[PDB]
Assembly symmetry: C5
Homo-oligomer: 172 residues x 5
Amino acid sequence: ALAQRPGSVSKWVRLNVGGTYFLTTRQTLCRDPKSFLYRLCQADPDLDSDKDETGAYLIDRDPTYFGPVLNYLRHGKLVINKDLAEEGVLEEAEFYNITSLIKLVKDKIRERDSKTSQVPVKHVYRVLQCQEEELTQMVSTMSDGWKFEQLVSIGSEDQAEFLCVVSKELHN
Amino acid sequence: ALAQRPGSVSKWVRLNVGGTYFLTTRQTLCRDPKSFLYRLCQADPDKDETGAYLIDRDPTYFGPVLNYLRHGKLVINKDLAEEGVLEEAEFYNITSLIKLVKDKIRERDSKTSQVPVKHVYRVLQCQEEELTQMVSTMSDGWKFEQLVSIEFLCVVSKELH
Amino acid sequence: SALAQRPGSVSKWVRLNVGGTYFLTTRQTLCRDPKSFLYRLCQADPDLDSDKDETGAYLIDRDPTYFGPVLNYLRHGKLVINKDLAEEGVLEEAEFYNITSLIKLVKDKIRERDSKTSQVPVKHVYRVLQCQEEELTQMVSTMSDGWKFEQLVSIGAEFLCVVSKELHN
Amino acid sequence: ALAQRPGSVSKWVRLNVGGTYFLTTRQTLCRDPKSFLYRLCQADPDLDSDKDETGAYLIDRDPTYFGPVLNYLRHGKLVINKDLAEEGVLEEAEFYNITSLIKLVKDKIRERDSKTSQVPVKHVYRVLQCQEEELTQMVSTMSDGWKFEQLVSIGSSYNYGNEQAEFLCVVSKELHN
Amino acid sequence: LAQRPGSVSKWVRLNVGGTYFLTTRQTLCRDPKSFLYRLCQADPDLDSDKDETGAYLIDRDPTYFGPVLNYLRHGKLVINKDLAEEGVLEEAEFYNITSLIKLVKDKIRERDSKTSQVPVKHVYRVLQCQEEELTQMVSTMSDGWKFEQLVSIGSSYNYGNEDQAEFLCVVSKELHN
């Protein structure tokens, strides 16, 4: 087997998922003994599950959502292309019963769900005040995050000459 | 049948939709006695010499249709146009599903189109000291607009969705 | 050598090899628009036999990526384009296969999504209202249909209230 | 001569690019006589290039980026799918060596490059001034592109000389290409 | 074909997890460190698992192979938009192509800092100016500054006088990389 060490032997297995052929090995299919695929892990002639004439095992499922599943079995990472529905993938995760994966999948969803849905950013407001002699400084030293909103005058020793409304963004 | 109990009913069917092969089972193709797919349902005699029934439809939109049959949830790829899935939902005549799609459509249409942000305004007033109090504890979604000195009038706003 | 037309040049099912991608429909579908060049297959026109592969598929030296939507129009009469798919490319096809009513529906899509996208400077319209202290609260709250409050001004009439409106063309 | 083979002097041609088949006519392969594709442009007597089981001209390139190339050769217009990367097209255009096309590509790249990142807009200002009465006249005639910034009441006076200017209006306008 | 008349050219088909790829032994020599290299020569007594159609079998996801094989073809890293580079990164590591894995991590880190980067800080200044010179002031602000607010400040009786100071003008400027 090209990829593996010379001298070794690999049991290639072909799956026909919903009409699309997938090539992989009995070895990759032992990853999860709780998955019904594990049935292939073990070599068995008196198991004869339905095959097509090329000998590929028949599965009645959408193949487009299968890749990410299979690939989880191959390298432990969940990887979904940007144009693909994770809902679809959650369904295959379940049908093939791979609890570790199902787990990750659900996280991928809430992770990108709390990202999507949220009403315009929340704003906080402060009111600053200063004597006139400290006006320049007050504004030129505006703290890191804040936005100037509005300057107001009072005035008539401690008299508060200028008010200043100032704002900030909240990101969550 | 690999994913099922040993010794089970399970007849495999191939569908050629618009020149794309789709494997499924008579079982999933009977979930609804109303579809035109229900004809394939119970084995009964247009196949290519690959034995696959021929269907004169676009296959890219069939995926979602076949999946509903498969599990009963409606799932659509982002890059995909729900009208496309609607059209097919009707062709094959899957009432329970035709319903679901018009939802997804109308759900994402209320999120799409709602006439420009209608703004509401109000003019709170307050005494000098409770000035901080006011602005500080401003209500859930309101923006500070302007502060006017008379003590003070504070104008505030909020959007409408 | 081709004494007569190819067998099943009149077959119900029809395969199209568009630039290297097979599409499967029925002769019927292709009889939708008599003015169209695809009608030729419908009318079993001898000419085509030059451009029919050996399996039987009709050869078309065009990009297939834009064909499906065209084909589907013929199938069910609605225009449907995938979100990532460029309409200009569909417009080129609609025109090549010369399907007038489609070409039409396509040009609508373009102008519809352009008037949406390319919003040109939102020119504005300002009005300076005047409201006494009292009728201060009412004036803003029940402001006119599409009018943003812009500023409130005072004068020891009591308040001038600038208000605005966005125009979109 | 021996037999009577049809399908010999044929107008159609199939290119197996990186393992995907592409269909076209020998003619389309004549747009740019500089491109090595031109070899198939005409029915070449003595040549004979490497084909596969199915008589397609094997090409060791990515087919996913070939589409635009071929289409250029078809109708002369460059058209790329929104999900595609022009770099990929750029690479192929060079391999097949189609100068006028390569030319079009680098335009598409730099064109959508000057769009992504560019320096924020420079505004411009103006201070209008007007009596109390001419207030509606001021707004009513604000020039085409100007936004209301702020309106200042001057608290108008009983002063000698300074007898002019009840309201000031700061106003603004962007600046573009 | 793509080669000048009378040239050595030995084709190979890779069946990557169910999908076929056409390439040449030539291409699979870019990195003598990758196992793909075992195909660099037309090894007579090799016998790596092939299928019916004599294509070498590989238990990996094809969808992320393109970018790899492409890098082998021309040496540039190319990915489409809808593809996760995390996926590409894996295969880059599986076939073991140092140079590639290198460039792929650049691509991720590049678009990580792009994705999530902090809002823009600002600078504020409060100028004061005579009623008269007020038009001048806003009219001639420097290249990067925005007008923020004007504050009438003197007193009806003083407005227009010289030891005055009639408005305070708040003014701001964005800061960029």
